[PDB]
Amino acid sequence: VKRTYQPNKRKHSKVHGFRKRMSTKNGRKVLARRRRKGRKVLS
Amino acid sequence: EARDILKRPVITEKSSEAMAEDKYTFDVDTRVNKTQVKMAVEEIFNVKVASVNIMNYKPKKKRMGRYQGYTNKRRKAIVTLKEGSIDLF
Amino acid sequence: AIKKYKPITNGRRNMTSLDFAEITKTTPEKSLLKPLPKKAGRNNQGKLTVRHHGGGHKRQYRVIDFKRNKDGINAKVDSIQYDPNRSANIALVVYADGEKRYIIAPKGLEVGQIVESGAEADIKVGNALPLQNIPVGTVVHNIELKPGKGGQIARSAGASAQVLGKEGKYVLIRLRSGEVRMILSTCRATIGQVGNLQHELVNVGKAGRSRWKGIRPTVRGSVMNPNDHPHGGGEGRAPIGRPSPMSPWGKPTLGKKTRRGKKSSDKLIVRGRK
RNA sequence: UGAUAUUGAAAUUCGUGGCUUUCUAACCCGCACCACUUAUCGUGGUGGGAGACAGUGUCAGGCGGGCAGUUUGA
RNA sequence: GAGUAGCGAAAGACGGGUGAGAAUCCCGUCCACCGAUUGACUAAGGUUUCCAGAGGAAGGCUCGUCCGCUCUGGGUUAGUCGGGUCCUAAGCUGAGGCCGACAGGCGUAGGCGAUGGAUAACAGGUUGAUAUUCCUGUACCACCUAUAUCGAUGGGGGGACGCAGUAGGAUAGGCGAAGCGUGCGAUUGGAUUGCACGUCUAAGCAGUAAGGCUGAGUAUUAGGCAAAUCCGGUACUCGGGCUGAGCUGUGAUGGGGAGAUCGAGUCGUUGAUUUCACACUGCCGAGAAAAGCCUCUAGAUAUAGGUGCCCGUACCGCAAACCGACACAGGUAGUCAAGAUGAGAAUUCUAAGGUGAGCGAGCGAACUCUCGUUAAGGAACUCGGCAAAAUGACCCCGUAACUUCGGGAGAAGGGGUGCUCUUUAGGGUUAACGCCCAGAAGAGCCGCAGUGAAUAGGCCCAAGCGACUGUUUAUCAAAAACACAGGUCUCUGCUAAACCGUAAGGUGAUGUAUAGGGGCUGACGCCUGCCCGGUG
């Protein structure tokens, strides 16, 4: 059976990722939130 | 510069077989070209270079008590000589 | 005329088709083509705003001359051609300068004969000229609506209108739908009827031949659920259990008029007919 | 669908008020040409078309399972 | 619960060796299994699993001396391969701009963006681990220096394109040879051209090459935002260019070989799903863009040595390295693909190559599963012929109603099919012999049986429904439900109705009443009666 999640390096970085996040006002809110929690990776 | 370009020579089985010919191996700075590695080997050793091949190597996993950690990333360059020899000893 | 097929297959049982005997060449003039990528009923936002549009055959746009501008310079018809984007055929007319451009082909122009534009031409098929210079009782086509803009009325296969009267600066005319209306006298028109009069008697024949044209299937509202259509719901088959039939957005859709009041053309139209 | 603001002009008409006409200066044109300009955006100029209408704000009446919140005894 | 269930599709055996310990590790022989794949490549994805030494705690459904596991040392080399320093599509962004309580939405010039266009390298050797990258040999491309031309930021040409169909030219590959090389020659009754293998080598250069396309000159000028000798028109005379697979040379005097430092590389025939090539013919559904490239003018002033950057390159890749929590009977684009048999890429057996399945040894109870056979009967079984059985290929003779004249039709129903020997008509290629491909008639021989195995429709009669191909409840429903071609009503005159959105902007549509949106009906045939009081 085909499963969800067929991985894809370039799709992964265009939908989730630093520049995509820093493009929207709500994406910068995600990254602010993860910084005050102290996550080791932000995106 | 020209001593920032070159870091240290490599001494293994595959490199001692290469200087049976006139091929010498160094570990260089990770941010330089072929054409800088070529113009730095004559300024230091005073030889005449015929070619330079470069390789980028990626960081390797390495544990000490099953830990995290990666080695440095490396850039090693094989230079061919037309005139002379490098006695790196 | 209309090529009729033998019933070799159930698909081609009652299926007809044009014979294409008027089309003189079978390849466009390369310097007059644009791309035409499909926009299949989807707008800015990317949402389907018009139903039943989809993926057909690929097409290139040909640049048609709807405002006939080159006046007092003759043009010889070089070729009649096929256009995928409209229901009429098109003609390639070469000017006396060496300037080629397409024209909508009228019902009775053959390859070779000449045409011309401007307010000093002959009243014969293929010519264009303002509406103050057309004698009452002529059938025209490709009728402008604002001067300089280009023709907009009577551009389908077999379409025409005829001039009726004259006011001070306007002109009476009856359209293909029987509505009577006055148009400004400075707006041009072409003499004749649009060709391809047998385009309507074609019997498509297959479901898959309407998928080649870009039409996608229609689900009747009766066989939907109540969250989809006002006509949805019910035991088995149901009648339209409402005073009037409704559209998929809940407006009345049989007899109820939708033209909006306070329009600037409320003066210009005389006799109405849909 | 009305009143009213943006909103002006001259006349005819029957009772200083209304009605209807006509005019154009306001407003409008997904309209032609010319600049910015490499530009099917925009802004400005020029001809044309329409014009005190339309569009827009406030107030008012109709319609309104298209869409909401709910009630539907012991 | 309990020393219980299970231990995940499939064949192993023995000998020798290593070790404290061997069904399980390494070497050998034989046997088996896949082979349009259990073989060879390569995208994606994964990230060191790759290689060599060493180890046996845990992981491995058993064991382990072994490992994709642990330990410490290594391994990826490019002017030409693929990507950037080149082009653009859908989309994504967008100076100024337009819109909006805020936040922001939209959009112009202009940019980003391959799954497409452009673009200069080949053969052989070599490592434990890389190679069109290193080495040997022979090349080609851009630039730089020594020894009129350049030319648009602009114009034109080009680039530049669908689907189907058949015929042809080649070549790769296969096959056969008393063509010639090499290397054997039998201890089971026989035989001795008798048995096995081999039978060639690029890019580049410079030659000629089936086929495919198609008038060429001169003058002229109201067009291509200015210009033009270029293009597009017009009038005149007169009726060889530019592309293209292959082949030959010569490379290179070398390189590789069946093999014993030496060593052959001929002839015939079958031939593509590759190439000439979307060429040619036909059809209607009418089949990207941009740069490189070639010209035009606004304008402007032939050998000798060198130089050539960045990123990827290991290994798995129908799999124990990827997605499925697992060393999981599932899923995972593309290229290559031999012999016998055949229409075949089907079937059965084999090649090149790979593999023997990470628990076993016994015994041969019930009962469960998967498979084979069955007296006499032959649907009596059962809700129901469910399941099983039977049919099955090629050839020939034959074939009903009904029909929309196409069908029904492989209707039904019958007969043939192995091998040997005679004689007999031709058709591919060649000067012949040859070498392939097919037929007809006769006379025999064997068996229970001759598509002797494997793979390959059961038929008929009548009734309801839906015309038909098609679509659907991923994971209890595939249908009489949905589509549909056709029919009908209605709304809509263009800044159209309709629809998305606060608007701006859009779809409709670069369309214009033979057009578009919505409601119902549902091929085709013959038809569709009455009622406008109530509601719209």
Author numbering:
A (entry chain 2): 2 to 44
B (entry chain R): 2 to 90
C (entry chain C): 2 to 275
Sentences from the study reporting this entry:
Pleuromutilin (PLM) antibiotics inhibit bacterial protein synthesis by binding to the large ribosomal subunit at the peptidyltransferase centre (PTC) and preventing the requisite positioning of the A- and P-site tRNA for peptide bond formation. Instead, the Vga- and Lsa-type proteins mediate resistance to PLMs and other protein synthesis inhibitors by target protection; they bind to the ribosome to drive antibiotic release, although the precise mechanism by which the latter occurs remains to be clarified. Sal(A) is revealed as but one member of a larger group of Sal-type ABC-F proteins that is likely ancestral to the genus, and which shows considerable variation in the ability to mediate resistance to antibiotics.
On that basis, we engineered an NTPase-deficient (EQ2) mutant of Sal(B), which was expressed in S. aureus; affinity purification of this FLAG-tagged Sal(B) from cell lysates successfully pulled down 70S ribosomes, as determined by negative stain EM (data not shown).
